[PDB]
Design a binder for these strands. Structure first.
Length: 82
DNA sequence: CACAGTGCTACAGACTGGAACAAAAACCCTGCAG
C-alpha cells in the first residue's frame, strides 16, 4: 500500500546495486561520507577558538590549522610508543 | 563606557666587547688619639 508507485531513492539503491558495488570495489563503509562530514565538527571549533578572526584572514588560519590537525607526523607522537 | 581574547604583525625590549671609570663593599692598615 505504501510502496505501490513510490520508493525511497535509498531503499532502491540498497536493494539493487550493492552486490555490484562490493564486487567492483570490495568496500563501501570505508568510502563513506563520514571522514568529510564528521570533520565539519572540527571546522566549527576551528572557526571559534583558532580563527583570526576577521573575514579576510580567518579562512587561511582555519585551513592551515586543520591541515596540521590531520597530519600523521604529529599523531605518531600520541602513543609515544605507549 | 563589558571583557577575554583573536594570530601575525610590528620592534619595542632582552643580549656582546673592550675600554675604563667610579662607587661601593669590607680588609688591611697607618694615623692620631684616652
Amino acid at each position: 500500500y505504501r510502496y505501490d508507485g513510490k520508493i525511497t531513492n535509498y531503499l532502491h539503491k540498497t536493494l539493487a546495486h550493492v552486490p555490484e558495488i562490493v564486487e567492483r570495489d570490495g568496500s563501501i563503509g570505508a568510502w563513506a561520507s563520514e571522514g568529510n562530514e564528521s570533520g565539519n565538527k572540527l571546522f566549527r571549533r576551528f572557526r571559534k577558538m583558532n580563527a583570526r578572526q576577521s573575514k579576510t584572514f580567518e579562512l587561511e588560519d582555519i585551513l592551515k590549522h586543520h591541515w596540521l590537525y590531520t597530519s600523521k607526523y604529529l599523531q605518531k607522537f600520541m602513543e609515544a610508543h605507549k
